[PDB]
Design a binder for this molecule. Structure first.
Ligand code: MG
Lengths: 100, 97, 275, 51, 140, 107
């Protein structure tokens, strides 16, 4: 369990597979998600399989399938700021300690 | 030397105390409790200043008028003198008039 | 009791300041203090003076033999500086003689030898090395570092620089950090001699020039406690020097010293060193 | 003097006129500034920490 | 005493850290120290201007001494070094008179040459060839 | 004033400009708390300006201690043994950057 996420290279064909299974036509980027049941089923399957759930704040922002696609292909990574700086290729005169 | 030599023993503050965690509750009991009670029926204190603010003269006048029948004799005399002084002060002393 | 916390805290810090001034702690070495990493600081010492070092050679150039003896003594409860130290001292003495002979050609060998001895002596090397973070990086037994150990580590640093990046770069290092210590300092503050009159007479016979005559040119208050005797040193009725003094003997001594300075090229008005 | 009296009249009155139109527009355009959400949320940033 | 002052030792010590070198009870008692330290800061602020004035007076005294040593006077030296477009100030002239006396003798000779050329120019009035040192260099 | 204060003559460390110029600053020691508003700007300094500052001048060793401090500190140690400890309490990134460049430039 972590918010560490990397978007898979086959996010697309997985996501055509899931939108096919929940329902269909061409131009499927423009499928409306105004119905609550279909959007619930889609996002529940995506969160169950990919291990990443849409937060409550971004839940109204996705109205088409294309917003669901643009949400899942951003890398959300997490670590402590010490691991952020220490892996940022420091020049050899920074020594950063973490007394925590 | 008017300063202490040693640091005082530390003030342990429990931010999740019983009063602190449940502070503020039922302050919106009117707007979403069908208006059966006011928030001002929640505050506890003196009888004469439950749900009412004023300056010192209005507070002393209200304290006299509401609970002066059962106040102590020297406390009542002090309050009468205080109301007399504050009446002489708010109405004859000042800069803005 | 005045309630509060910040005033008592500030007073505690001020009392700790007074305690640190009144009975100050013995000077502990910098390596036994917080915020210290030896490798990054050796790299920064390399980059500080604007050249490159081989890091293993510099690490060996900072390790004294007394440190090995001490840590084996503590072990019962590493390469030293040596070959680097004689390498550095040998090349430093040769380069300093080369620099002092190229610019100041008329000087005798004894004077140049004593100038080189002064520039590699304990005083000026321990003054330079304590202002280049050599003592902080020096790994020794005790603190503060004794002057012989500090001089040995400084010449080990010069030797490591030699083996790292060549005689021209090491010559520039010596030029920038040892020749520059001669600035504003006169000759006989550096090469201390006794009886300068005899040295002047010998040097004057070396040029096939007649013996100088001491001759009182100027004077003021001859019988007061504060005289001014200007003894000039003449040769064939043309002076080689003139010098002041409180009495005639010290004035003649100063005239001989001024003649020695003028003959050898240490006038105060000489050409400055070019950098 | 370079000209007589009768020549000076109205020769620079136009500049005085639009100079006062400029200072009048300056006096009649003083009004409270725009308020943004960005400054208030910038104040919300005062508890930003590390992770 | 709901909130009386806890941080009063440090204000007294902020004033008294300036008065530690005074004489008598000014260096100890806060009242006398406040009066003397306010006066001392005022004296510092005015003494910057006084320092400039006294230092220029010192330079003028030194230049007067050296030019009198060469036989001239200070007004002749300045008013005749200005006329050759030698725009040195008194500080440099005074330090030159101390440390480098032959350059000061050259400056004195130059000023005397300009003085004599000015005397020759203002005596024979009319169109005359100007002195060699008397020429000015225009700047456009 | 000047009589209540010690004075010195203008000088350099080891004739600092004759042969070569030597960066007179050795070290710098920020103590930057993970949670605390006082060091908030200092936190952003460590996010933004410290790597560029160190790559601008490699002779200076920079330590970010990141202890749970209350007032953050920059400690500039110099070649002649001097220590100048300065408080970056309640300062923005720009004032901290100018102060750190002030410490780095001077002797
Ligand atoms: Mg003036």
């Amino acid at each position: 369990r972590s918010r560490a996420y990397t978007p898979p290279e086959d996010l697309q064909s997985r996501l055509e597979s899931y939108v096919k299974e929940v329902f269909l036509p061409s131009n499927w980027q423009d499928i409306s998600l105004e119905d609550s049941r279909l959007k619930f089923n889609l996002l529940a399957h995506l969160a169950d399989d990919l291990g990443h759930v849409v937060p409550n704040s971004r839940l109204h922002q996705m109205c088409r399938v294309r917003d669901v696609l643009d949400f899942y292909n951003v890398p959300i990574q997490d670590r402590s700021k010490f691991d952020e700086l220490s892996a940022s290729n420091l020049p050899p005169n920074l020594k950063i300690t973490w007394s925590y | 030397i008017g300063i202490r030599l040693t640091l005082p023993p530390p003030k342990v503050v429990d931010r999740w105390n019983e009063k602190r965690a449940m502070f503020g509750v039922y302050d919106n009991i009117g707007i979403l409790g069908n208006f059966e009670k006011h928030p001002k029926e929640l505050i506890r204190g003196p009888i004469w200043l439950r749900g009412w603010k004023g300056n010192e003269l209005q507070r002393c006048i209200r304290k006299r008028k509401m609970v002066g029948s059962r106040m102590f004799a020297d406390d009542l005399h002090n309050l009468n003198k205080r109301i007399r002084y504050l009446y002489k002060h708010f109405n004859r002393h000042g800069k803005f008039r | 009791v005045k309630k509060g916390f910040r005033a008592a805290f500030r007073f505690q810090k001020e009392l700790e300041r007074q305690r640190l001034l009144r009975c100050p702690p013995p000077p502990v070495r910098r390596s036994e203090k917080p915020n210290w990493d030896y490798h990054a600081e050796i790299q920064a010492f390399g980059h500080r003076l604007q050249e490159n070092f081989s890091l293993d050679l510099l690490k060996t150039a900072f390790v004294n033999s007394c440190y090995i003896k001490s840590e084996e003594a503590k072990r019962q409860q590493l390469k030293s500086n040596q070959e680097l130290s004689e390498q550095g001292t040998s090349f430093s003495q040769t380069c300093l003689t080369q620099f002092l002979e190229d610019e100041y050609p008329d000087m005798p060998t004894e004077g140049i030898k004593n100038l080189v001895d002064f520039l590699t002596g304990e005083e000026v090397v321990c003054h330079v090395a304590r202002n280049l973070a050599v003592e902080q990086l020096t790994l020794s037994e005790e603190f503060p570092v004794p002057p012989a150990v500090l001089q040995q580590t400084f010449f080990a640093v010069i030797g490591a620089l030699l083996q790292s990046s060549g005689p021209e770069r090491t010559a520039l290092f010596i030029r920038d950090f040892l020749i520059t210590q001669m600035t504003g300092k006169e000759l006989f503050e550096m090469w201390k001699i006794i009886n300068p009159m005899g040295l002047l007479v010998e040097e004057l016979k070396k040029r096939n020039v007649s013996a100088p005559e001491s001759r009182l040119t100027r004077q003021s208050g001859g019988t007061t406690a504060l005289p001014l005797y200007f003894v000039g040193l003449y040769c064939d009725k043309k002076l080689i020097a003139e010098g002041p003094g409180e009495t005639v003997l010290v004035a003649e001594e100063e005239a001989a010293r001024v003649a020695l300075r003028k003959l050898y090229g240490f006038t105060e008005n000489r050409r400055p060193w070019n950098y | 003097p370079y000209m007589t009296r009768e020549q000076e009249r109205g020769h620079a009155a136009v500049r005085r006129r639009e100079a006062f139109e400029a200072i009048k527009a300056a006096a009649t355009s003083k009004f409270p500034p725009h308020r943004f959400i960005a400054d208030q949320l910038d104040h919300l940033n005062v508890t930003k920490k590390w992770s | 005493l709901r909130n009386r002052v806890t941080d009063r030792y440090f204000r007294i010590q902020e004033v008294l850290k300036h008065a530690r070198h005074f004489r008598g009870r000014k260096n100890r008692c806060y009242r006398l120290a406040v009066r003397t330290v306010i006066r001392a800061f005022v004296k510092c602020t005015k003494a910057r201007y006084l320092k400039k004035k006294n230092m220029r007076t010192l330079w003028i005294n030194r230049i007067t001494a050296a030019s009198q040593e060469h036989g001239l006077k200070y007004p002749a030296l300045i008013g005749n070094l200005v006329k050759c477009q030698v725009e040195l100030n008194r500080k440099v002239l005074a330090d030159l008179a101390i440390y480098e006396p032959k350059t000061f003798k050259s400056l004195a000779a130059l000023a005397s040459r300009r003085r004599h050329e000015g005397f020759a120019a203002a005596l024979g009035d009319g169109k005359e060839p100007e002195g060699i040192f008397s020429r000015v260099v225009q700047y456009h | 004033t000047a009589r209540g204060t010690p004075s010195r003559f203008l000088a350099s460390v080891l004739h600092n400009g004759l042969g070569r110029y030597v960066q007179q600053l050795q070290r710098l020691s920020f103590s930057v708390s993970r949670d605390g508003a006082s060091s908030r700007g200092a936190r952003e300094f460590v996010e933004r300006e410290v790597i560029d500052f160190a790559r601008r001048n490699p002779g200076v060793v920079i330590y970010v201690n990141s202890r749970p401090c209350c007032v953050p500190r920059v400690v500039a140690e110099y070649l002649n043994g001097a220590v100048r400890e300065e408080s970056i309490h309640c300062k923005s990134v720009e004032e901290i950057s100018t102060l750190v460049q002030k410490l780095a430039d001077q002797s």
